[PDB]
Design a protein around this motif. Structure first.
Motif, PDB file in Angstrom:
ATOM      1  N   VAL A  51      37.584  57.867  24.690  1.00 37.88           N
ATOM      2  CA  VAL A  51      37.646  59.320  24.709  1.00 37.88           C
ATOM      3  C   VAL A  51      36.317  59.906  24.237  1.00 37.88           C
ATOM      4  CG1 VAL A  51      38.711  61.373  23.686  1.00 37.88           C
ATOM      5  CG2 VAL A  51      40.145  59.465  24.432  1.00 37.88           C
ATOM      6  N   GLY A  52      35.441  59.041  23.727  1.00 33.06           N
ATOM      7  CA  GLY A  52      34.144  59.480  23.264  1.00 33.06           C
ATOM      8  C   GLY A  52      33.008  58.910  24.097  1.00 33.06           C
ATOM      9  N   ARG A  53      33.298  57.877  24.896  1.00 36.99           N
ATOM     10  CA  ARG A  53      32.271  57.257  25.732  1.00 36.99           C
ATOM     11  C   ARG A  53      32.494  57.560  27.214  1.00 36.99           C
ATOM     12  NH1 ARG A  53      32.505  56.728  21.851  1.00 36.99           N
ATOM     13  NH2 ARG A  53      31.146  56.005  20.149  1.00 36.99           N
ATOM     14  N   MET A  54      33.340  58.548  27.497  1.00 36.05           N
ATOM     15  CA  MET A  54      33.652  58.939  28.869  1.00 36.05           C
ATOM     16  C   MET A  54      34.492  60.214  28.881  1.00 36.05           C
ATOM     17  SD  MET A  54      34.317  55.945  31.617  1.00 36.05           S
ATOM     18  CE  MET A  54      34.923  54.460  30.819  1.00 36.05           C
ATOM     19  N   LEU A  55      34.090  61.183  28.071  1.00 38.66           N
ATOM     20  CA  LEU A  55      34.793  62.456  27.987  1.00 38.66           C
ATOM     21  C   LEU A  55      33.827  63.536  27.542  1.00 38.66           C
ATOM     22  CD1 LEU A  55      38.155  61.191  27.573  1.00 38.66           C
ATOM     23  CD2 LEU A  55      38.124  63.676  27.281  1.00 38.66           C
ATOM     24  N   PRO A  56      33.221  63.406  26.351  1.00 37.04           N
ATOM     25  CA  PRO A  56      32.225  64.374  25.908  1.00 37.04           C
ATOM     26  C   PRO A  56      31.147  64.522  26.980  1.00 37.04           C
ATOM     27  CG  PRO A  56      32.703  62.807  24.158  1.00 37.04           C
ATOM     28  CD  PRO A  56      33.392  62.299  25.393  1.00 37.04           C
ATOM     29  N   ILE A  57      31.114  63.536  27.887  1.00 35.75           N
ATOM     30  CA  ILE A  57      30.162  63.506  28.984  1.00 35.75           C
ATOM     31  C   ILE A  57      30.746  64.165  30.243  1.00 35.75           C
ATOM     32  CG2 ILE A  57      30.367  61.046  28.357  1.00 35.75           C
ATOM     33  CD1 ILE A  57      31.297  61.076  31.050  1.00 35.75           C
ATOM     34  N   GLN A  58      31.958  63.759  30.622  1.00 33.19           N
ATOM     35  CA  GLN A  58      32.618  64.296  31.815  1.00 33.19           C
ATOM     36  C   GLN A  58      33.494  65.505  31.481  1.00 33.19           C
ATOM     37  OE1 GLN A  58      36.144  63.013  34.691  1.00 33.19           O
ATOM     38  NE2 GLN A  58      35.591  61.305  33.344  1.00 33.19           N
ATOM     39  N   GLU A  59      34.099  65.481  30.301  1.00 40.52           N
ATOM     40  CA  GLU A  59      34.965  66.561  29.855  1.00 40.52           C
ATOM     41  C   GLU A  59      34.201  67.874  29.809  1.00 40.52           C
ATOM     42  OE1 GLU A  59      36.052  67.599  25.961  1.00 40.52           O
ATOM     43  OE2 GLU A  59      36.972  69.192  27.164  1.00 40.52           O
ATOM     44  N   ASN A  60      32.873  67.781  29.799  1.00 43.30           N
ATOM     45  CA  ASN A  60      32.031  68.965  29.766  1.00 43.30           C
ATOM     46  C   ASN A  60      32.477  69.971  30.824  1.00 43.30           C
ATOM     47  OD1 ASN A  60      30.353  67.872  27.707  1.00 43.30           O
ATOM     48  ND2 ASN A  60      28.566  68.853  28.646  1.00 43.30           N
ATOM     49  N   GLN A  61      33.112  69.464  31.881  1.00 42.86           N
ATOM     50  CA  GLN A  61      33.599  70.304  32.968  1.00 42.86           C
ATOM     51  C   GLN A  61      32.436  70.888  33.757  1.00 42.86           C
ATOM     52  OE1 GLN A  61      34.921  73.269  35.081  1.00 42.86           O
ATOM     53  NE2 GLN A  61      35.091  71.090  35.589  1.00 42.86           N
ATOM     54  N   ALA A  62      31.707  70.018  34.448  1.00 48.07           N
ATOM     55  CA  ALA A  62      30.563  70.441  35.240  1.00 48.07           C
ATOM     56  C   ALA A  62      30.313  69.477  36.400  1.00 48.07           C
ATOM     57  CB  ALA A  62      29.333  70.543  34.354  1.00 48.07           C
ATOM     58  N   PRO A  63      30.127  70.001  37.627  1.00 50.76           N
ATOM     59  CA  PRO A  63      29.887  69.166  38.809  1.00 50.76           C
ATOM     60  C   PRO A  63      28.591  68.364  38.702  1.00 50.76           C
ATOM     61  CG  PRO A  63      30.415  71.429  39.441  1.00 50.76           C
ATOM     62  CD  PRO A  63      30.144  71.434  37.965  1.00 50.76           C
ATOM     63  N   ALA A  64      27.459  69.047  38.837  1.00 45.09           N
ATOM     64  CA  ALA A  64      26.159  68.395  38.742  1.00 45.09           C
ATOM     65  C   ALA A  64      25.107  69.355  38.186  1.00 45.09           C
ATOM     66  CB  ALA A  64      25.733  67.870  40.105  1.00 45.09           C
ATOM     67  N   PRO A  65      25.409  70.024  37.057  1.00 47.45           N
ATOM     68  CA  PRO A  65      24.508  70.970  36.423  1.00 47.45           C
ATOM     69  C   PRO A  65      23.700  70.337  35.292  1.00 47.45           C
ATOM     70  CG  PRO A  65      26.800  71.320  35.718  1.00 47.45           C
ATOM     71  CD  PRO A  65      26.656  69.932  36.296  1.00 47.45           C
ATOM     72  N   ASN A  66      24.392  69.931  34.228  1.00 51.46           N
ATOM     73  CA  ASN A  66      23.741  69.304  33.085  1.00 51.46           C
ATOM     74  C   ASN A  66      23.363  67.867  33.420  1.00 51.46           C
ATOM     75  OD1 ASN A  66      25.078  71.666  32.147  1.00 51.46           O
ATOM     76  ND2 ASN A  66      26.749  70.422  31.308  1.00 51.46           N
ATOM     77  N   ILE A  67      24.237  67.198  34.165  1.00 50.98           N
ATOM     78  CA  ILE A  67      24.005  65.818  34.565  1.00 50.98           C
ATOM     79  C   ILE A  67      24.553  65.571  35.979  1.00 50.98           C
ATOM     80  CG2 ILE A  67      24.019  63.445  33.717  1.00 50.98           C
ATOM     81  CD1 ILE A  67      25.066  64.450  31.071  1.00 50.98           C
ATOM     82  N   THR A  68      25.384  64.542  36.160  1.00 46.18           N
ATOM     83  CA  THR A  68      25.945  64.246  37.473  1.00 46.18           C
ATOM     84  C   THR A  68      27.198  63.381  37.355  1.00 46.18           C
ATOM     85  OG1 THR A  68      23.664  63.448  37.682  1.00 46.18           O
ATOM     86  CG2 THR A  68      24.667  64.259  39.668  1.00 46.18           C
ATOM     87  N   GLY A  69      27.906  63.521  36.239  1.00 50.43           N
ATOM     88  CA  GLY A  69      29.118  62.751  36.029  1.00 50.43           C
ATOM     89  C   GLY A  69      28.858  61.414  35.364  1.00 50.43           C
ATOM     90  N   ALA A  70      28.282  60.480  36.116  1.00 50.41           N
ATOM     91  CA  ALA A  70      27.991  59.150  35.589  1.00 50.41           C
ATOM     92  C   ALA A  70      26.502  58.830  35.674  1.00 50.41           C
ATOM     93  CB  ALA A  70      28.800  58.102  36.337  1.00 50.41           C
ATOM     94  N   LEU A  71      25.884  58.618  34.515  1.00 46.55           N
ATOM     95  CA  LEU A  71      24.463  58.293  34.443  1.00 46.55           C
ATOM     96  C   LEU A  71      23.604  59.462  34.921  1.00 46.55           C
ATOM     97  CD1 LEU A  71      24.777  54.721  35.991  1.00 46.55           C
ATOM     98  CD2 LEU A  71      25.535  55.581  33.769  1.00 46.55           C
ATOM     99  N   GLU A  72      23.604  59.704  36.229  1.00 47.89           N
ATOM    100  CA  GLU A  72      22.820  60.792  36.804  1.00 47.89           C
ATOM    101  C   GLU A  72      23.005  60.855  38.318  1.00 47.89           C
ATOM    102  OE1 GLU A  72      19.226  62.451  36.707  1.00 47.89           O
ATOM    103  OE2 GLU A  72      18.759  62.279  34.567  1.00 47.89           O
ATOM    104  N   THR A  73      22.255  61.743  38.963  1.00 46.52           N
ATOM    105  CA  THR A  73      22.334  61.904  40.410  1.00 46.52           C
ATOM    106  C   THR A  73      21.900  60.629  41.125  1.00 46.52           C
ATOM    107  OG1 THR A  73      21.596  63.301  42.253  1.00 46.52           O
ATOM    108  CG2 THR A  73      19.991  62.878  40.564  1.00 46.52           C
ATOM    109  N   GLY A  74      22.169  60.564  42.425  1.00 51.33           N
ATOM    110  CA  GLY A  74      21.797  59.395  43.201  1.00 51.33           C
ATOM    111  C   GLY A  74      20.301  59.154  43.206  1.00 51.33           C
ATOM    112  N   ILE A  75      19.810  58.474  42.175  1.00 50.79           N
ATOM    113  CA  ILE A  75      18.387  58.177  42.063  1.00 50.79           C
ATOM    114  C   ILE A  75      18.134  56.674  42.113  1.00 50.79           C
ATOM    115  CG2 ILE A  75      17.894  60.262  40.747  1.00 50.79           C
ATOM    116  CD1 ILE A  75      17.661  57.161  38.767  1.00 50.79           C
TER     117      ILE A  75
END
Length: 82
Positions: A51-75
């Protein structure tokens, strides 16, 4: 393949009892005891740790603004393209 009592057979294969009982100790003894004690803890910690290694990150409730869900955008900066 050989269990106690009849284990006297010259053929080794003794794990039939030793392992079978160990397997029995976790399923039958580890199901009622470890089941609630162990799982109750793993769910408390494994769920609390996730809940801390996959929530404070995704729970942020954002598509691709601050990040991109997992790690980052398709780079393919890692040079792992195809």
């Amino acid at each position: 393949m050989a269990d106690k009592t009849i284990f006297n057979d010259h053929l080794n294969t003794n794990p039939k009892t030793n392992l079978r009982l160990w397997v029995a100790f976790q399923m039958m003894k580890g199901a009622g005891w470890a089941g609630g004690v162990f799982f109750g803890t793993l769910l408390l910690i494994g769920f609390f740790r996730v809940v801390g290694r996959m929530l404070p990150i995704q729970e942020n409730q954002a598509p691709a603004p601050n990040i991109t869900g997992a790690l980052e955008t398709g780079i393919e900066l890692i040079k792992h393209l195809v």
